[PDB]
Amino acid sequence: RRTGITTEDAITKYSVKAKTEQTAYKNATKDMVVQAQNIMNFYSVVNQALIPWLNAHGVGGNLRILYRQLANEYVKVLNTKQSGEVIKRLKIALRHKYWLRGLDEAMLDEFMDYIDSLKSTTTNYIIFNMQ
DNA sequence: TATATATATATATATATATATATATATATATATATATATATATATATATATATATATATATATATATATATATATATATATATA
Helix, strand or coil: CCCCCCHHHHHHHHHHCHHHHHHHHHHHHHHHHHHCCHHHHHHHHHHHHHHHHHHHHCCCCCCHHHHHHHHHHHHHHHHCCCCHHHHHHHHHHHHHHHHHCCCCHHHHHHHHHHCCCCCCCCCCCCCCCCC
16 A cells, blocks of 8 residues: 555545444454453553552652653553663653653652563453364 | 320421432542543554555466457368259
């Protein structure tokens, strides 16, 4: 396929596919039931490592989300299968980015030293089983 | 007229039992809307290429599979016309 496509062609696709995309979402519910426990695995392995750190290092209520933004982006980079040779660069990239959004670096050096215990989350939960 | 037995009305308060309204905040249970981002689950659109899966069009030839037309004759299969 190309790239360069007009504004009308994409709108024409999205408008005419409405019936098929909703009758495909109706089957994607059946598929989502068994695959949805990656949510449970994700928040288990993130809260089990961040609730003691945030809770005992002294950060407040509503800044915990900004720290979750940092940790969640790091876990996304992890479970797209990317090991330490890219992580040693994306750690200082994320450090500068969330310093730029108003955090304090006396928290950030300790937090970037802390996030090496977060790992990959998502697995597969549908086996083939031809029998 | 005064009592004992039950059905409802009032007179004026304070109680115990349940149905809903408010007064003003705080909380536990669920349905949705927002504020602002970063995630995990799926439906489609794009940005830009290279892949694997199938539907068709072309580029240029060569080949295996069948449907018909010709080129030039010779022959096996049947339908009819002539020659004598």
